[PDB]
């Protein structure tokens, strides 16, 4: 069964502020499967979100990042007039610094060819052929990625912190995000377990599906 594609991630600053945290930019410790899936779609230049349902993603967290709070005069749609001071609101947003993680992509469950794994591979062998827009980022648009490269299981030859689906875990990461409200958002309960393996344990293969 073809070896799943592995990507090495290194983002200086990132924030995956949780859903129900709309008053505060408080973030998940780990990139959620939905955000990673969206970033992979951006890398392969896939605007449609339903194109690559079924791809299984597993995240290995190389180093636990530090959580820091920053202030931002974020703009909101409260008043019809743009210049009205009610739009600008000062609030805190948490960020994760020096995030290094490895991503496993298993696109065997995809029913549409070419699969996401093939698209990512072909993108990496021939960067000039792939046509897309924007700048690759994880989380917020201004949080660019320092390094995303094809890597093996031995790239750090170290000890890995995996995200494992546990029904009694702490983190509640969403694998499908409903941006308008919260109807279609689907959550899974995870945990961070420190294990010395170069391959993900079964559960880690968080498999993205449509909310239906």
């Amino acid at each position: 069964m073809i070896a799943p594609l592995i990507l090495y991630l290194d983002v200086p600053f990132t924030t995956f502020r949780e859903s129900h945290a709309r008053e505060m930019g408080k973030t998940y410790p780990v990139p959620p499967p939905a955000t990673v899936y969206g970033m992979l779609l951006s890398l392969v230049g896939e605007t449609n979100v339903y194109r690559h349902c079924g791809v299984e993603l597993a995240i290995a967290m190389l180093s636990s990042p530090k959580k820091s709070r920053i202030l931002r005069q974020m703009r909101r749609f409260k008043n019809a007039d743009f210049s009205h001071p009610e739009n600008v609101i000062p609030c805190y947003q948490e960020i994760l610094s020096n995030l290094k993680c490895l991503i496993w992509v298993r696109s065997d469950e995809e029913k549409i060819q070419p699969s996401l794994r093939e698209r990512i591979q072909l993108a990496f062998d021939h960067p000039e052929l792939v046509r897309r827009f924007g700048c690759l980022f994880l989380g917020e648009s201004d949080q660019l990625i320092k390094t995303i490269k094809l890597a093996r299981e031995d790239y750090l030859e170290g000890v890995r912190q995996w995200a494992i689906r546990d029904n009694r875990g702490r983190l509640t990461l969403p694998y499908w995000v409903d941006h308008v409200g919260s109807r279609n958002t689907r959550f899974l309960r995870y945990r961070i377990e420190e294990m010395d393996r170069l391959s993900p344990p079964d559960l880690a293969w968080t498999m993205v599906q449509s909310p239906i």
Binding site: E23, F77, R170, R183
Partner: protein, 328 residues
């Protein structure tokens, strides 16, 4: 649903109020109805703000991670016993530790508890309602909790100042500082002196130092790295013992020796030293005047290297602590 049901679930864009609203199943809505009972509430006091000139209004909400219904129920009912003056804290970590202060400690069972602290504070003076300003996760293990109990035991409690309808509460900053460092996992003795003296010219917590100096030493004793500075403390105490013996010999019969005045002179002279050279001059001269020191003989090379390497401000700080900790 709305923010009153789920804390932090405000509609960011009011013009899209009908559509962009958080949605939940009815049973989870009932849970969001019944959340308030579990979470306790604490009042936060800004150390920079004089409590006399500013009554507390920041509200810390402690929300505990749930591992078992019965365990959480027993914990909440136990925490019901505490006095309101305990609830007034000076740090989010202090409130979190207080929420787990009454938990039973079992040595066979690996104790581990997690809780969230949600800070609510008015953005400005005329703010109509409080806004969520900080959320911080606290994970307490066995060692952290027993260290916090040890700090609570050694360090003094809050002074329940009571005035005209004014029951002010004096929180010991040091306890919070230690607790914070504990949560950080960093050494408790991160910089107590800085807070106690440098920052605390008023001696608000410096007095607490006076009240809990032994406790400070106790933790310092726990600190292995302190060892060398402990040996230096003993060396300076022996030197001042020799100097006081010399003064006693100089003291005339019937006259009262001015040992208190000499100690005050020692503090003033040490505080006068302004650079490395002058302070090292005075320290070496005082050590010579002390006489034969056993401790400085046993640990010759270590103390010599400590004097040569350590910045003179630090050596002055520990010399002042030695003077304050002198007890014949």
């Amino acid at each position: 649903i709305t923010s009153w049901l789920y804390l932090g679930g405000i509609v960011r864009h009011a013009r899209t109020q009908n559509t962009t609203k958080l949605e939940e199943k009815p049973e989870y809505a009932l849970a969001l109805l019944f959340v308030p009972v579990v979470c306790h509430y604490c009042l936060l006091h800004i150390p920079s703000e004089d409590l006399k000139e500013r009554k507390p209004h920041r509200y810390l909400v402690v929300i505990p991670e749930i591992k078992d219904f019965e365990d959480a129920s027993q914990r909440r009912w136990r925490l019901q016993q505490l006095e309101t003056k305990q609830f007034h804290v000076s740090s989010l970590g202090e409130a979190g530790l207080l929420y787990y202060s009454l938990d039973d400690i079992q040595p066979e069972v690996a104790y581990y508890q997690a809780c969230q602290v949600w800070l609510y504070e008015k953005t400005n003076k005329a703010s109509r309602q409080r806004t969520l300003m900080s959320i911080e996760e606290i994970k307490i293990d066995k060692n952290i909790l027993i260290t916090y109990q040890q700090v609570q035991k050694y360090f003094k409690t809050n002074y329940q100042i009571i005035k005209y309808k004014q029951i002010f509460i004096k929180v010991n900053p040091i306890r919070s500082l230690i607790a914070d460092n504990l949560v950080k996992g960093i050494h408790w003795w991160s910089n107590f002196w800085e807070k106690l003296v440098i920052e605390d010219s008023k001696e608000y917590l410096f007095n607490q130092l006076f009240s809990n100096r032994e406790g400070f030493i106790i933790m310092a004793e726990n600190s292995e790295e302190d060892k060398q500075y402990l040996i230096f403390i003993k060396v300076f105490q022996q030197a001042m013992k020799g100097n006081f013996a010399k003064i006693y010999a100089k003291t005339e019969e019937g006259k009262d020796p001015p040992i208190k005045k000499k100690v005050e002179r020692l503090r003033a002279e040490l505080n006068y030293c302004y650079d490395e050279l002058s302070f090292k001059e005075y320290l070496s001269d005082f050590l010579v005047r002390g006489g034969l020191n056993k401790y400085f003989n046993e640990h010759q090379e270590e103390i010599a290297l400590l004097i040569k390497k350590s910045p003179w401000q630090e050596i002055r700080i520990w010399s002042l602590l030695a003077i304050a900790s002198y007890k014949p």
